[PDB]
Each structure stands twice: as structure tokens, then as C-alpha cells.
Ligand binder design. Structure first.
Ligand SMILES: CCCCCCCCCCCCCCCC
Ligand SMILES: CCCCCCCCCCCC
Ligand SMILES: CCCCCCCCCCCC
Ligand SMILES: CCCCCCCCCC
Ligand SMILES: CCCCCCCC
Ligand SMILES: CCCCCCCC
Ligand SMILES: CCCCCCCC
Ligand SMILES: [K+]
Ligand SMILES: [K+]
Ligand SMILES: [K+]
Ligand SMILES: [K+]
Ligand SMILES: [K+]
Ligand SMILES: [K+]
Lengths: 281, 268
């Protein structure tokens, strides 16, 4: 009873582990099947642009070119505009950017477009995160509570007008759809349409960014406050504000998918029992 | 009835404002020195090589700027590790999908893989939670019958979680990273924090800088991540409870003061 269920626990964990391993193997085989074709073509067309510049300029230091490229690669890790023209650059750590950077830290999005290179900044970031991450979780919980109860008001009016004859257990389906329906409008679609017309992104690049942002994965390959274009500055505030509330939306969405995985686990759990039982033994 | 959210919001805003002012105070000094020493290293290359001209350098820079979009990537092992960055929401970003299908798959792979990982991390966190429960049962006998009372023992037993934990999940993997990737002292601890906090800037990655590492190394990293995430998950939530107490202690301390201030105020 005390450590007898602990055996029933460890058997549950190991089985999850392998489902995750398989899922990482499946995802692996899919991604390289999707990216390796465009990898090689970019890998092979960059050696041609090497030989095109090695040979056309014999007087350049033929092998010290990679020495230069590595220094530009080292410059890439900083915020740079290394050009003949445009010798006055912009601050990547300005009064507004460091504010947005702190938002990447406590939310654990961490786009990485701007990362600290100072040993003091590194240590502060460590202390700023370890105390700021729990701080934000309480704000996100409070906002998630507000949205949870804001939606509770808006669904109360919707769960009475649909009360015809022969309607509670099958109304919980239609009311969770309007959460997704309205939800992916205000927190995915509408901010994606805005990003498309402000950052110049494509259709998918906007939705891809919203997902990567609000899933707090944050690759940083797309960031709303990365480039220099115009940035009204009525724009950088509403972004992290959107993030604050949008995170609360996916927090439910991801957890709803989680419960959808609970059921499908059980339903395949019993269906494997059905199948191994019957079918002419 | 009462909100209590708005008050937290402003504490977070001020914390983001203070953190902002600190970060640029820490980085903008080294921002200038690196931006001024790149302009010198650019004239150093125009002057030392009359071979290359003003117009031909900027053509090269834009090609490397075009290479920023790309840079063996996405091999049989790398895409496996990349999927680990997605479901754990670490997302180092050193390797990101450039294909329309890869982006769409990644969206679907995340929306369904993030909850999937949540249950595995919960199961491992359960094991560590009960593995540690065995380790403290022996610690809560041998010197607890002796002088100190047990409400004051809840202090010493939570220290051994932090003390022995930041050894196995921060220090020891950082010492290994220091001697395998050649990182410095802080760069190892900085990576462990950024990794296990799920922030994952990607400025340091155990799978990148690909010259020197073996096939006995890339498995153990994600394995360490799986268990180390469960460790910070508690650590961050414990710090959360520290704040939840300190809030309530300053909560009532302001009441104590606003009591006497207004209590004398009425008496005038
Ligand atoms: C233009 C981008 C659209 C991307 C939308 C992705 C929607 C996901 C649909 C996946 C359908 C599979 C359902 C399997 C149920 C477990
Ligand atoms: C010898 C260099 C060791 C660097 C370790 C600094 C870590 C600071 C963490 C602060 C936590 C309170
Ligand atoms: C009146 C309620 C204010 C809540 C106080 C929380 C502030 C915690 C600061 C911790 C700094 C290390
Ligand atoms: C009462 C409903 C408030 C909805 C706010 C919508 C926020 C959109 C953020 C972009
Ligand atoms: C969620 C689908 C997982 C497929 C593996 C099934 C093993 C019983
Ligand atoms: C970072 C410390 C903030 C303290 C705020 C106290 C508000 C009563
Ligand atoms: C390992 C460092 C913990 C220090 C805690 C300080 C609490 C006042
Ligand atoms: K992240
Ligand atoms: K990142
Ligand atoms: K990230
Ligand atoms: K990068
Ligand atoms: K995260
Ligand atoms: K997290």
C-alpha cells in the first residue's frame, strides 16, 4: 500500500518515457526529412560563393578569409551593422530593449536575439531569473484567473440561450469550442495579422511566431522587437502585454491538450486490452 | 470581488523596469567597446588588403548576412536533440526550421509534444520527489530526536535539498561541461541555469560548437535535462513560496503601520 503503489508508479513513468523517446525519434526523422534538402542546397551554394570570391580576388588572403568570417560570426553574436555606410548603429541595449529583454527572462521565452555578454550581466541574469521566474508565474496565474473568470461571465450568457428542450454534459463540448474559437482569434489570428502588416512577415511566419512565442519555446528566429524598421513605440509595450495574456491562453490550451492526452491514453489503454483479449484469441 | 492582480502587475512592471536599467548598465559598456573595436577591425582589413575595395567588402558581408539564415546540421542525432528543445520549451534556437512544412510540423509537434513532455516530467518529478522522501526519512530520525524541535527542522531538511541538489544538477554537470566544451567557470553555471530554467537563450548549447564531443555525451545531456528540469521546477516553486510568505509578511506589516498611522490620526 505504501510502496506497493510506488511499483505501479514506476511502471507508469517508464512507459511514458518510451512514448516520449519514440516521439522524439519520430520528430527527429521528420525534421531532417524536411530541413536536410534545404540544408544541402544552402551548404553547396555557399562553397560556390566562396570559390567565386577566392578565385576572382587572388590577392586576398586566401586562407585568412575564414579568419575574417569567424570575426563576423563573432560580430553576429553581438548587435551589429558592419558596413561601409551606416557607421552610426542603433542600441540593442537601449532604454526599451533591456525592458523587453527582462520580459524574455522572467517569462522563460528567452528569444536569445539579445543576450548578456558581461560577466556581471550573466550573474545578474541568473539572479534576475531565479527570482523573476517565480515572480512572473504569480502574475501569469492572476491574469489566468481573470481570463478564466472573464470567460466565465461571457459563457454564462451563452450557456442559457442554448437551453432548449433536450439539451449539461453535452453542452460542455460547445462551450469549450467557443473558448478555442474566440481564443485563436484574439490571441493568435488578430496579433498575427498585425505582425504581418508591421514586421513584413508572411502568413505562416506570423502564426509560427505566435505559437513559438506563447508556447514559451521562443527560438528567436522571429522576434517582434528584433529589427530596426520603424517601431512606433506604441508597439513594443503592447507586444509583451499581448504575451502576458496570450501565455495565459496557451497555458489553458496546452493543458486542455494534456487532458485530451489523458483520455486518449486511457482509451488506447483499454483498446489494447480489448484487442489482446478477443479476435479468436 | 477584490482583484489583487493589479498590485502584482505593478510589482512586476517595476521589476522589469529595474531589471531593464540594470541590464543596459551592465551590457551597454561592453556594447560600445565591441562596436568600436569592430570598426577598427574593418579599416584594418580595408587598409591591409588593397586587394578588396569598399564595394566588394559589403557584398561579402551581405552574403554572410544571408548565411545568418543558415549558418553538419539536422543529422540523425541533431534533429532528435532539436525535438527535445521543442517539447521541453527550452528552444535554444541554434537550429530552427526554415521549411514551410518544418514550421507547420513544428507548430503541431509543439502543441502536442509540450503536453506530452509535461507528463513525463511530472512522472520523473514524482520519482525524485519520493526518492528524496526516502533520503530524508533517514535524516529525520538520526538527529531529530536530539536537541532541535521539528518545526525548526523543516529548515535544515530543505537546505539539504538545495545543497545536495545544486551539487548533482548544477555543479557536477557544470564541471563536466567546463572540461568537455572548454567553457569557463561561470559559462558552465550560466548554461545550466539558462537550460534548466527553460529560458534557453542558445548563446551556450551543449550540442553546438561541433568539433570535440563523443556519442556518449549527447544522450546524457538531454537525460540530465529531463531530471534537472524537475529539480528547478521545485526550486523555482520553492522560491515562489518564499515570495508568497514575504508578500504576506509585508502585507500585514503595512497593515500594522497603516493601523497606528490612521489610529492616531483619528484621535488627533
Ligand atoms: C497555415 C498553418 C495551419 C496549421 C494548422 C495546424 C492544425 C493542426 C491540424 C492537425 C490535424 C491532425 C489531428 C490529429 C488528432 C490527434
Ligand atoms: C569562480 C567563478 C564562480 C562563478 C559563480 C558565480 C555564481 C553566482 C550565483 C549567485 C547566486 C546567489
Ligand atoms: C503590498 C504587496 C506587495 C508584495 C510584495 C512582494 C515584493 C517581493 C520583493 C522581493 C525582493 C527580493
Ligand atoms: C474583457 C475581455 C478583455 C479582452 C482583452 C483582449 C486582449 C487582446 C491582447 C492583444
Ligand atoms: C499518442 C500515440 C502514441 C502511439 C504509441 C502507442 C503505444 C501503445
Ligand atoms: C523589488 C522590491 C519591490 C518591493 C515592493 C513593495 C511594495 C509594498
Ligand atoms: C545556496 C544559497 C542560498 C542562500 C539563501 C539566502 C536566504 C536569505
Ligand atoms: K524558451
Ligand atoms: K532561443
Ligand atoms: K528559447
Ligand atoms: K543565435
Ligand atoms: K520555456
Ligand atoms: K516553465
Amino acid at each position: 500500500s505504501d510502496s506497493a503503489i510506488n511499483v505501479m508508479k514506476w511502471k507508469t513513468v517508464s512507459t511514458i518515457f518510451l512514448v516520449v523517446v519514440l516521439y522524439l525519434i519520430i520528430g527527429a526523422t521528420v525534421f531532417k526529412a524536411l530541413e536536410q534538402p534545404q540544408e544541402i542546397s544552402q551548404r553547396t551554394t555557399i562553397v560556390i560563393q566562396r570559390e567565386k570570391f577566392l578565385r576572382a580576388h587572388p590577392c586576398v588572403s586566401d586562407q585568412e578569409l575564414d579568419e575574417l568570417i569567424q570575426q563576423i560570426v563573432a560580430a553576429i553574436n553581438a548587435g551589429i551593422i558592419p558596413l561601409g555606410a551606416s557607421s552610426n548603429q542603433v542600441s540593442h541595449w537601449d532604454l526599451g530593449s533591456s525592458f523587453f529583454f527582462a520580459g524574455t527572462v522572467i517569462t522563460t521565452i528567452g528569444f536569445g536575439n539579445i543576450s548578456p555578454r558581461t560577466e556581471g550581466g550573466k550573474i545578474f541574469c541568473i539572479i534576475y531569473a531565479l527570482l523573476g521566474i517565480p515572480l512572473f508565474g504569480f502574475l501569469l496565474a492572476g491574469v489566468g484567473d481573470q481570463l478564466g473568470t472573464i470567460f466565465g461571465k461571457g459563457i454564462a450568457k451563452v450557456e442559457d440561450t442554448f437551453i432548449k428542450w433536450n439539451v449539461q454534459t453535452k453542452i460542455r463540448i460547445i462551450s469549450t469550442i467557443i473558448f478555442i474559437l474566440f481564443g485563436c482569434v484574439l490571441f493568435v489570428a488578430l496579433p498575427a495579422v498585425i505582425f504581418k502588416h508591421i514586421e513584413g512577415w508572411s502568413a505562416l511566419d506570423a502564426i509560427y511566431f505566435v505559437v513559438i512565442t506563447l508556447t514559451t519555446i521562443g527560438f528567436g528566429d522571429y522576434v517582434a522587437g528584433g529589427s530596426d524598421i520603424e517601431y512606433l513605440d506604441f508597439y513594443k509595450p503592447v507586444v509583451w502585454f499581448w504575451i502576458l495574456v496570450g501565455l495565459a491562453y496557451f497555458a489553458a490550451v496546452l493543458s486542455m491538450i494534456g487532458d485530451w492526452l489523458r483520455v486518449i491514453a486511457k482509451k488506447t489503454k483499454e483498446a489494447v486490452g480489448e484487442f489482446r483479449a478477443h479476435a479468436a484469441e
